[PDB]
């Protein structure tokens, strides 16, 4: 179930994005509703450090690929 | 007439990407191999759908679009593009490049019918550059030190890897590699390079000199 | 027309170099095998980029340049080089050997167009000797 | 007519070199100041004899000779040198540049008589470049870290100083300074630079951004 | 008096913002000088935790509403 | 002719917002009730000044401006806006929407004189959407 | 003919900047003093290299570029700029303002030859404004 | 006296070179005999670490400045 | 036998070189194989201090005479 | 016609070198004595083979080669060398000086036939200087 996917405290972001995109594209949603759902799940899941990282984006991110690129650039190396 | 790529080659390439990663030189060589004949947008799109995961595939779609847009800007900046024609009726729109134009959506046969060879090679080069960008993006040189027990060839391999797989310009890699050989590479090799009667002006020459005069231990 | 080497053979050769090393006689035999047809500078350059690590690749670039320079000295010492021609307009510069000349930089098709078979075999022998030197030097 | 430089200015410059050193930007500015009018070999030779110690003076004589030899090679490579003439009888030998030619040894008046203005400016530029070389030689960027208690402007000053006063090419200083800002500069500022909504492509822009958004403490 | 308004140690930020905007708009300042004054009072008043929170803003905040939104997002829940 | 809203209704709505909050469905229903007739910029501005605190009022001014700008972009994207006219001389500027145009600043009578009914309904819908945004943002 | 600024004045100004700082009114007065005659890009560049530290010098290069770009935008917005000419062949490019144009790179004599007095005063005012910005930013 | 100058166990090399060049140039030697004497004093004084450093010079050093530059380059940082 | 010649712990280097060159030239080797053998015996015999001295030669020594000269220059006086 | 040096004188000189050493003034005087008449490369080579040990002989071969190379550089710098001739066909190669040229290898009679007296005196002076260098180097 896509709506139950959370980014674990120790999980990296690319694994979380892979799992989420897999569960959203392999589901019962229409094809035209996958990108907005993936974006809004990146924003509300993806534990509050990345949540604030996406929130304070000086540019407007309108695509899952752009969000992934931005987060991978500005992520907290740890 | 359109002929699909072998699923055996595609499966082997997918497993190569799965084990070696996106950035290994063997993987880029394999991609260049399967990028030899000019591919139709359908072929490259399905290829990247199969070999790349979901998130790298999204990144690659973005990068491919950006590179194709740069190509179309250069095309409107020069009416002699091998994708363009002489009159204005042959100007190539992004719907024709991404395979979204009329008579092409989902049909590879019609795609191969209406597309130009210049269109195909431009699409292919754009896709290759986008793959390179995404590979460089998906996965620090100034923090590399030669360990107390590490050999010098391992340190040189690690350093050259991290310097060439970084964000430096191509014309700034050799001086950085040299100056990192001189300041890293624990003080025995530092003094060995310092007291070089000849002037070493290349990483290969420094490596050869150090391998010759190194303290066998 | 340029045809690339199989990435399957290149992957097998890379794993051979990874397990057996650079100096084993089986590795040199495999390199001689993949060095059978005269290769263009693009082919040999990418091959050494893939099979060799970063530091051995730097060493190999150095050694290849030195051997090509010896070849060009022998070429200016004999106007009957299979890479040269009879007139002075066919003299072969190192930009043409290393693939740096005009119409060749980054393009293997144009490379295969302008290059001579003698040029190709000289480049290939030079690359093989450079590989031997670097293998003897690395370990 | 030859006029000597003031011993007061020379004494002040010597004390500047004594307190600030050879490589400080104020010292190089003062040398450029006293290197304004084209000097005769006698003037520059005595100036370097007075302001430099014995060993730096030996080094400077060596470097000046090498630079003058490069100048004479360029002069024999171009008959239109402002020191040369059109015919072969005006070709300038190193004895005339170093002040060793006939009618010049030890006599500044005769020196000023026979020398050309192009000769003077070439000698002067050669001496300035030699001074720069010796100053860079007489007295490590990749070992610079921002201390736990150090401010960011001090760290940036130290890093830019060590990078610009090093053996790197001029075209490789800005990328190195940027990549050292990103990997040094302890992880709070590292994350501050990483999460930059804009792309910072200049050390000045990075410094401005960090100074704006820094944690006041 | 607007220039004497400080955020108390126990006061929330929305109460402080309400009080400050009230005192600044109900004062003798020209209409074109209220927003810059409100911003610069948010930055120098509003006890040093929120001061540092506003200082380390990756984006440039150029409006009292934007500053209020940012602070309400990233405030220390307590 | 301009008629003001009853201060009794405004006081009741202010106390509703004070006890129930900004986001309760009863509060949104009450706002929709007092948002029934098309209001002039003066009316909505004073209403939000009274019912909202200082910080929510700043947020609401921001959001109202943004929504009005979207409306004006749609208006320049379609010359058939009920606020626009057919010729270019009836194009509606943001000074006329926010009540800042000439003959309107501070005067509700002149405001009601020069404004169009389409202008009024667009301003009203914009203010309602801005209130929804701020209510979703405040808590 | 180009005449350099006295290194004595430059040394005194550098020590003034060292003791008083960048923002003191005495320092700005001294800079205005040494900014009296229109300077060539070489002069201002070397002056800021000597009086400013490395990081303030980087900041000043950035700010000077931005201000010169604003000047060039105003210049393309008005063909009557004292740096411009009447025809299109006298339009002033940023390579000519920053001293990067042909016949100017590293040579102050040629610089003084090809530059216009309007060019010089515009460069000087731009450099002064950039110095003010950097001084306000550094402390 | 120039012929009594030794590089101390703790003294740096530039101080030793300064002292030696001072004592040699401020002495009774002819001007044409100072450079060879300075070189041969660099080689025989200047305690055996620097002695061996100068001895094993792949290039031939024929000037006090060149010897000083070489030693400063390849000296044992300590 | 040349292949059994070692430099003794107390023996000087010129004596060792004399003994080695004597035994190599007065042996059954071809004339064209004496110099490489003498060099490679200098490198592997000649106890590890001189071994490291020859190893760390900034120049390439390609003759027994050159090796002897280099070692005599940079040898540890004792 | 070639006449060999007496083995009695050579034995006495060898014992002198054995007891007094290479650097004694008596030894250098004796060498100058046996270096009086211009010797052929064969004579000097055998003389140094007999009087010098193996390692000094290697050093002396090196030094003799270097000095002969300096002589040949001076010879190509002056066509009036007593070893050279006027035309280019008499230019003296190092194979002719070291006795390696055609018709000379191992044969002292042919050597004495083809060699010039200037060649002989140059070879002799070169050998004497090389002996001096090696003697100064050995101890």
Swiss-Prot record, chains A, E, H, I:
The record marks 28, 40 as: Involved in capsid protein dimerization upon acidification. It is found in: Virion. Self-associates to form the irregular polyhedron core composed of hexamers and pentamers, that encapsulates the genomic RNA-nucleocapsid complex. Assembles as a tube in vitro. Binds to inositol hexakisphosphate (IP6), which allows the assembly of the polyhedral capsid. Homodimer. Homomultimer. Homohexamer. This is Capsid protein p27, alternate cleaved 1. It comes from Rous sarcoma virus subgroup C (strain Prague) (RSV-Pr-C).
